[PDB]
Amino acid sequence: EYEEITLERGNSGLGFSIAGGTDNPHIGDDPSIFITKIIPGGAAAQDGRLRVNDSILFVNEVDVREVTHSAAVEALKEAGSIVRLYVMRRKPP
């Protein structure tokens, strides 16, 4: 259950806000990098109109979710001008 969303990344900052992974967890029951907020006027808000909770499965080709949140935030910015977001449904509140 993974949705494929290509989004145009902003220059030095994107426009999303991630909750935590294995290092820093919102939940010790599923270490999966979540978006808890959309940054207003950024990449997420301009290019589409998703939900935050879209749980970053693969970004580009890097295997995130069960990572440090620092490896997924870095792989989100390391996408360049174009974030290729692939997002799995595990725990939707």
Add this chain to the structure above:
Amino acid sequence: YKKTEV
């Protein structure tokens, strides 16, 4: 936890 802005 801490939410990192991206």
